[PDB]
Amino acid sequence: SEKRPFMCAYPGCNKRYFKLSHLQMHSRKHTGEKPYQCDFKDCERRFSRSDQLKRHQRRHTGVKPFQCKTCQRKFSRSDHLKTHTRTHTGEKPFSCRWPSCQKKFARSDELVRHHNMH
RNA sequence: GGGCCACCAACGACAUUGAUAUGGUGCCC
Ligand SMILES: [Zn+2]
Ligand SMILES: [Zn+2]
Ligand SMILES: [Zn+2]
Ligand SMILES: [Zn+2]
Question: Mutating residue 77 to A/S has which effect?
């Protein structure tokens, strides 16, 4: 129906946001002011999302709440824990790039290693 | 200005398959 909540006013950008609080925070990127930044005593780095802000700030605390329940290995990111967990299930979501091949892999390292074998 | 997750794409640590890493898009005030 071509209906949207809120959009950016800058020409060429014109991204859409589902909250006015994020639309005003996005607008800071055009005026030239940081939206998010590390509040740590000896840090000045900046980010474009609250997710990145927390992700970065955990670098100072060393808090890693993502852990396996089969080998108990620990990771700083949930996306990486799942890439590890699939090694216990035997699943391999990747595939060889060559048309004359049909092998499958689970890590980018395995895929690239096989692409070098070709 | 802050919270919460998932999925997708990059990433290279190789004893080990990683007690290892970044981004994008989203949802709540
Ligand atoms: Zn914009
Ligand atoms: Zn910091
Ligand atoms: Zn495990
Ligand atoms: Zn192949």
Answer: Strongly reduced binding of DNA and RNA
Q: Decide: residue A112, CB within 10 A, 0-12 exposed, 13-18 middle, 19+ buried.
A: exposed
Nearest nucleotide by C1' from A83 CA? B18
* φ, ψ of residue A57 in degrees (nearest 5): -65, -30
A97 CA → B2 C1’, Å: 43
**Method by which this entry was solved:** NMR
Please report, rounded to whole angstroms, the spatial distance between the CA atom of protein residue A45 and the C1' atom of nucleotide B12: 25
Domains of chain A from N-terminus onward: 66-117 (3.30.160.60)
Q: Which residue is listed with tokens 């980010």?
A: A47
